Design a protein around this ligand. Structure first.
Ligand SMILES: O=C(O)c1cn(C2CC2)c2cc(N3CCNCC3)c(F)cc2c1=O
Ligand SMILES: O=C(O)c1cn(C2CC2)c2cc(N3CCNCC3)c(F)cc2c1=O
Lengths: 150, 150, 150, 47, 398, 50, 50
């Protein structure tokens, strides 16, 4: 900074403290009262959601191995597994709507093969409907999966 | 540093009387905090193509960048695709070789943050902490002692 | 929609090679249609005002709304928006020994907004009670205040 | 046309009374499956 | 019956579900600090850990960042509920959890903490809810707009089949102005440049230049040790240099005094504006509430208009539902004639409609559900199943 | 449609005008379109009648 | 340049809205050729120069 008269040197540390710290101290988080940071990703106004979140793990997975001692990833606030429940409790519902129907067909007609023809006349129709929504633009949504049940 | 009124007419207003000649637009809203931060939302019609609507908006801000402070130009200006809500929120902590809520925040933003935000169409990423920076805490008593200023 | 963008993302690579006078002036890339359609005239009847008072009110209430509304290409003001106009007398300039360089410097100093920090932020001492934003130089508001610049 | 008229949408409720269609496609496939095929299986084999 | 059991049946848009994940926000009064709001986020974490171990897997508090905006006055804990299998009852499901969470934070606290549900949806479509906005159209200012909005919130709360209304964005806190007398400055020989980058680069910080830490280019910032910039009296501790080589304190030219401003200036469509966030009454519903807020806006002073930010553009069981159902009849009849030939056949199928509807309304109105989206599509599935059953009755018999 | 929405913003602006400020309409294309429908769909109708 | 042609100096605020500040001259000191010599620049040594 300076060289004062007598040959003395004023340095930057002689007037000020110097530490390596963040560029913004306005916010600091705590994971269960434990000192933590984190990436709070937000969606991109048309993005594919659960496909995008699968690829948040893509980069993250290649990063894990080169972590300092102690650094570990944890998962609060996560939407992904809600989608896994809306398929496994809808395609399960789907399957129960056959199983139960199957009985009604036997109850009224004791002929086995008769309780079969209608049991094939809906699994096929289900699939054809998947192929039209794909062709028109739509996706497997919470809504369009409820339309496979109704 | 700027207070609420400072940002209101040095950044905010300048952009608002230069946010015109854009295809599709229902309205424009804005905030201007005392923490020196402004953020405008230009909402469009139902499914207006966000790939081009983003561009038109950020090719119009550009005609007003020279009429802002040099402090704001060298700071982060941005035009991004929004979705008022998070989905994946990857927390990051330490267990064995314990470190602070600042050491962890830098490692997040200097290895894995830049990869995430570009991956699978992420809108924007909010750091929950801050990336490191050569921080300098000037003492005013040891500043007058050698006859000096910031 | 894209041909406009390509053109104005190419002008940007040549903005630094222009004068600083042209950068801070209105550069624009807009969709054209050599011809008008609606031309909304604006006059006064009872409380009569000038062809200058009316031109400012047009451009400070209703012009900015029109140009962004329902995909307008560009808007041509038929007059001019108000501005703190200063008519320098060269005889009363030599009388106190001065130039327009000293006039210009006095406006880029007294007429300005400064970003002072804030009490209580940003990384505080653990135990502070209050946190408010510091105000500093405020931009001038009236013709009288511009007359009292030193 | 109980369904698709209601699937002419309106605003933020765009894909809501919309993705009917999911269920009209289902209707026309069950009509298809039944106009084709069920005829077959029924004849092919029953009692 | 089919009428009465429908008009009275209320109107929602979509269920606010348990999503395995909810959250809760924090807010402190005029000019609180980071140390103050951290005390509140700490107390919040204990209800979710000490008094809720069975239902809460984790917590992720964040000091000084509300979902309103920003500042040291705010906060936000991101909750992650334990999996659905381990949560058995209605007791241990979001509606119930956020019920006694809000009660606990309103009982043993003195700030502002809630615990809102997790829509799905977006922020909009709350149903029996609106978002008003108050514009300064003329050349008034912040002080004149604030006063006008107080009159709108007060007239709302002085004649409400009522209404609930809430600003909660502007709060309105003081500010420490520093008048720099310019004739005093240049007398003793200090530049006004030097002075502004002393006050600016000391208190607020200043982005100077880039450096390199461990390969990656980061930033260099310059400010001050915290203790020389906490209160009003530390302004005079800073000494600027004047032309003639000697030091000069800030107390020389500066002048301290407080002043009321706002830490959140909002503006709607090129003009200043302030948000109004009232929800419609528990009796009334939206269309009624909004129109009995419009006549309150026209009773306000001059240069004060309004505009509806911004919810919605035209709704669903409102307006829409009609027009769609309307045409849905128009065709049903047409195509029941494209295979039938009469002016009698279609009518038969065209009044099975209410048979199946009074049943749908019965179940819906009886149990604690409502006319939402899922009800508004089981309805049309049933006119399809009614014409089905009927058409068999007709076709075979004809 | 664009010119109809030039009236949209303009209409919300009228009430907050100073004393005397009034809007007038020279050079306007809009009503030429109203004549090319009402003297074409009228022509249409005369082609039946005849 | 800032006398005859004008010069965009800095922004101010009139009645809420940010507008511009311009600097030029009273019209009569910039109409004809002979008014060039009316302007006196300042030289280093403190004295005026036409
Ligand atoms: O803005 C949007 O989100 C959409 C806009 N459009 C219209 C084109 C601008 C759509 C059009 C659709 N159909 C048009 C008629 N043929 C079938 C497809 C559609 F199914 C969805 C959308 C949108 O989601
Ligand atoms: O004043 C506030 O900040 C809030 C006020 N209210 C009540 C309406 C006045 C809320 C109501 C909420 N819920 C009501 C029940 N259904 C779900 C939404 C909510 F989540 C948040 C808030 C606030 O933040």
């Amino acid at each position: 900074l300076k060289v004062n008269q007598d040959g003395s040197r004023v340095l930057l540390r002689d007037v000020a403290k110097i530490e390596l710290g963040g560029e913004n101290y306005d916010i600091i988080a705590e994971f269960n009262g434990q000192p933590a940071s984190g990436l709070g990703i937000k969606l991109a106004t048309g993005a594919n959601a659960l496909d995008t979140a699968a690829a948040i793990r893509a980069e993250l997975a290649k990063m894990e191995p080169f972590f300092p001692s102690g650094l570990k990833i944890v998962y609060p606030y996560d939407t992904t597994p809600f989608v896994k429940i809306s398929i496994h409790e809808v395609v399960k519902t789907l399957v129960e709507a056959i199983i139960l129907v199957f009985l009604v067909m036997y109850l009224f007609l004791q002929n086995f093969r008769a309780t079969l023809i209608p049991t094939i006349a809906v699994p096929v129709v289900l699939l054809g409907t998947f192929a039209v929504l794909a062709a028109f633009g739509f996706s497997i949504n919470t809504l369009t999966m409820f339309g496979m049940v109704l | 540093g700027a207070d609420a009124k400072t940002v209101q007419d040095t950044v905010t207003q300048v952009i608002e009387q230069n946010m015109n000649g854009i295809d599709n637009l229902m309205y424009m809203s804005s905030n201007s905090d005392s923490t020196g931060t402004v953020q405008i939302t230009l909402t469009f019609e139902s499914g207006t193509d966000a790939d081009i609507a983003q561009v038109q908006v950020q090719a119009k801000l550009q005609l007003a960048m020279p009429l802002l402070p040099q402090e704001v130009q060298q700071q982060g200006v941005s035009v991004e695709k929004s979705s008022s809500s998070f989905l994946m929120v990857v927390g990051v902590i330490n267990t064995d070789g314990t470190m602070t809520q600042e050491d962890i925040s830098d490692y997040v933003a200097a290895n894995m943050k830049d990869a995430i935000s570009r991956t699978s169409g992420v809108g924007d990423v909010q750091l929950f902490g801050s990336q490191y920076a050569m921080r300098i805490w000037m003492n005013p008593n040891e500043l007058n002692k050698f006859q000096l200023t910031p | 929609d894209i041909a406009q963008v390509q053109v104005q993302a190419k002008l940007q690579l040549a903005m630094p090679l222009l004068p600083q006078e042209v950068q801070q002036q209105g550069v624009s890339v807009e969709k054209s249609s050599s011809s008008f359609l609606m031309v909304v005239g604006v006059i006064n009847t009872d409380g009569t005002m000038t062809q200058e008072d009316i031109s400012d009110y047009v451009a400070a209430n209703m012009k900015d709304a029109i140009s962004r509304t329902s995909g307008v290409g560009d808007v041509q003001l038929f007059g001019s928006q108000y501005a703190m106009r200063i008519w320098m007398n060269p005889n009363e300039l030599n009388k106190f020994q001065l130039t327009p360089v000293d006039v210009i410097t006095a406006i880029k100093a007294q007429n300005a907004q400064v970003a002072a920090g804030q009490l209580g932020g940003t990384p505080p001492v653990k135990g502070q009670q209050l946190n408010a934003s510091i105000i500093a130089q405020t931009r001038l508001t009236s013709t009288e205040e511009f007359g009292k610049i030193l | 046309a109980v369904f698709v008229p209601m699937a002419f949408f309106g605003g933020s409720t765009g894909a809501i009374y919309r993705q009917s269609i999911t269920i009209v496609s289902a209707m026309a496939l069950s009509v298809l499956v039944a106009l084709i095929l069920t005829p077959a299986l029924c004849a092919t084999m029953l009692k | 019956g089919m009428a009465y059991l429908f008009v009275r049946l209320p109107s929602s848009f979509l269920p606010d579900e348990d999503q395995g994940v909810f959250m809760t926000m924090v807010q402190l009064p005029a000019g609180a600090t980071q140390e103050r709001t951290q005390k509140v986020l700490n107390e919040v974490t204990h209800y979710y850990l000490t008094k809720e171990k069975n239902n809460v897997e984790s917590v992720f508090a964040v000091n000084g960042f509300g979902f309103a905006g920003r500042g040291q006055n705010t906060g936000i804990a991101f909750v992650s509920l334990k999996d659905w299998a381990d949560r058995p009852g209605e007791e241990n499901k979001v509606e119930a959890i956020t019920m006694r969470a809000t009660r606990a934070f309103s009982q043993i606290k003195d700030a502002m903490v809630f615990a809102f549900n997790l829509p799905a949806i977006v922020e909009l479509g709350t149903a029996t809810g609106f978002d008003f906005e108050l514009i300064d159209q003329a050349g008034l200012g912040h002080e004149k707009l604030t006063q006008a909005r107080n009159q709108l919130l007060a007239e709302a709360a002085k004649h409400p089949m009522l209404t609930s209304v809430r600003p909660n964005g502007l709060e309105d806190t003081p500010q420490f102005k520093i008048d720099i007398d310019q004739e005093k400055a240049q007398a003793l020989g200090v530049s006004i440049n030097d002075i502004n980058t002393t006050l600016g680069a000391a208190w607020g910080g200043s982005y100077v230049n880039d450096f390199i830490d461990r390969g990656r280019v980061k930033k260099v910032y310059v400010m001050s040790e915290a203790k020389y910039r906490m209160l009003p009296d530390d302004i005079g501790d800073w000494y600027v240099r004047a032309a003639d080589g000697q030091m000069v304190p800030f107390s020389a030219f500066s002048s301290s005094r407080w002043e009321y401003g706002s830490p959140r200036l909002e503006r709607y469509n090129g003009l200043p504006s302030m948000e109004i966030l009232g929800q419609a009454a528990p009796g009334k519903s939206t269309g009624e509430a909004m129109e009995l807020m419009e006549q309150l806006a026209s009773k306000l002073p001059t240069g004060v208009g309004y505009d509806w930010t911004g919810s919605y553009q035209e709704r669903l069981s409102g307006n829409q539902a009609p027009s769609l159902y309307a045409i849905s009849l128009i065709v049903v009849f047409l195509c029941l004639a494209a295979l039938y030939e009469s002016w009698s056949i279609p009518f038969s199928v065209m009044l099975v409609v209410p048979l199946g509807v009074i049943g749908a309304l019965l179940a819906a109105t009886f149990r604690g559900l409502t006319n939402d989206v899922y009800f508004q599509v089981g309805l049309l599935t049933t006119i399809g199943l009614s014409a089905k059953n009927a058409i068999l009755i007709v076709e075979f018999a004809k």
